[PDB]
Design a protein around this ligand. Structure first.
Ligand SMILES: O=C1NC[C@@H]2CCCCN12
Ligand SMILES: O=C1NC[C@@H]2CCCCN12
Ligand SMILES: O=C1NC[C@@H]2CCCCN12
Ligand SMILES: O=C1NC[C@@H]2CCCCN12
Lengths: 269, 268
């Protein structure tokens, strides 16, 4: 792993491990998600930002401010096989006072073809109060020198799937997985439930018949609230659709408080 | 990763990843366990055996026979930090008709000091009937050429922790974590619940104040039965003492035993 020649992006190669593959002998979407997070963290380290998943500046730490993901969007064309080398490039861009965006391009190291792409929107919030806030000028200036100043988008299209509005699933859901609880492996270095865990929980309510005959092509997830260590979650899915599409909702098992919402698109294997 | 000069052992280096560390900025025991499994799998690949976690020979596949873990024992002296390079060496040894043993030595790449060690006992069984069998002469001859013929033990000391008898926890347990269920990430490439998941489940019933003030030094686990995708498990722990605990995993319904084990923790 290293920053690229112009220092405005970061690249790193990964060799798919035996325990990282699923029922098809290819990397799972959760293996891909961890690798996206790993390369994002290595990028923050390289330019001096925090490495705790909050990618903070010295000014942000003084003010108890952190970066939090509001939306994650991943599109995989080909899942790498066990032992394959995948190259991932990542970069950040400011979206003015709104927040920041981190993009990723996944490539097969051998052919150089783009096997996937991802985008994420991040908002600033006070860690203690949980209150969101627009990005200050001082913080913006600390980061802008590490970003390309001309737009560089992983999803440049006009009506791309990464910007689609996501509705709230209405009861009754077609399918459900109830009483899901995080274990210590589901928490990060700061005892917070990892965003990759939520991807796994969304996918738990997809029937096994879909998982067996299809491959996940797109997953978009809108994050609303954090799930604590002692929280219990219910994962809800309703079919909305050649391809299959689903609408997802994660909510607390008790009061039904919303944690996440999302959509998936699957293609016949 | 590569087989060593004499071809009777396999070595590989790993750089600790950001998502592999815990609340102490060091690798978790589950990160270590996955790396042990990864290097065991790379060893099987290198000499032509199956890479599905069963390490089968051509004769075993013809007879629907597989290798299954009966006991796992891990001892960690120092957990590697994020970004550190850990070298792991692994080898197998036949234990006659009983079964086979896989050993591991973990080292800090920079200093060369032994930061940890592990041992595992494996038994042969028909994958369909689940009936255990003593190892046939034909199968023994297929893999003896890949093993050191003189004993090479990660735990050579007589009366060592890796051989201790494990009793069954008696009700009431001091602590418990009930209704644990595996998700798809908890299954391997063949839709079976990964052995590393059981290590996580044993540790769920340890109080958080132990986890916060101590480091896990030793974990021994005796495997009795597999947990299916739709099974629900209860993890039970009682203090026996450093701090020591006795563990039991059992089905949430009938109380059928899945696993039993012991842990030893050192104050931070
Ligand atoms: O935390 C901050 N804020 C600005 C400065 C730039 C160099 C890396 C660390 N940085
Ligand atoms: O996890 C949380 N808690 C509130 C905030 C809303 C936007 C992104 C996700 N967030
Ligand atoms: O006899 C057998 N059965 C499978 C394995 C392949 C490598 C050579 C020795 N082998
Ligand atoms: O996982 C299973 N199923 C039966 C067998 C008995 C001893 C080794 C571990 N076991």
């Amino acid at each position: 792993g290293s920053l690229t020649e112009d220092g405005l992006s970061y690249k790193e190669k990964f060799v798919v491990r035996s325990y990282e593959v699923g029922s098809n002998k290819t990397a799972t979407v959760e293996t891909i998600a961890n690798l996206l997070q790993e390369v994002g963290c290595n990028h923050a380290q390289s330019v001096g930002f925090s490495t705790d998943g909050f990618a903070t500046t010295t000014t942000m730490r003084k003010l108890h401010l952190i970066w939090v993901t509001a939306r994650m969007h991943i599109e995989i064309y080909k899942y790498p096989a066990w032992g394959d080398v995948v190259e991932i490039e990542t970069w950040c861009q400011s979206e003015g006072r709104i927040g920041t965006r981190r993009d990723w391009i996944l490539k097969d190291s051998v052919t150089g073809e783009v096997t996937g792409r991802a985008t994420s929107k991040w908002v600033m919030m006070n860690q203690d109060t949980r209150r969101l806030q627009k990005v200050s000028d001082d913080v913006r200036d600390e980061y802008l020198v590490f970003c390309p100043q001309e737009p560089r988008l992983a999803f440049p299209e006009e009506n791309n799937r990464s910007l689609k509005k996501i509705p709230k699933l209405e009861d009754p859901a077609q399918y459900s997985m109830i009483g899901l609880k995080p274990r210590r492996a589901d928490l990060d270095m700061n005892q917070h439930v990892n965003n990759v865990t939520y991807i796994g929980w969304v996918l738990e309510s997809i029937p096994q018949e879909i998982v067996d005959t299809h491959e996940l092509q797109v997953i978009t997830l809108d994050y609303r609230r954090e799930c604590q260590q002692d929280d219990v979650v219910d994962s809800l899915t309703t079919t909305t659709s050649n391809d299959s599409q689903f609408l997802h909702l994660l909510r607390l098992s008790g009061d039904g408080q919303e944690i996440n919402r999302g959509t998936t698109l699957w293609r016949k294997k």
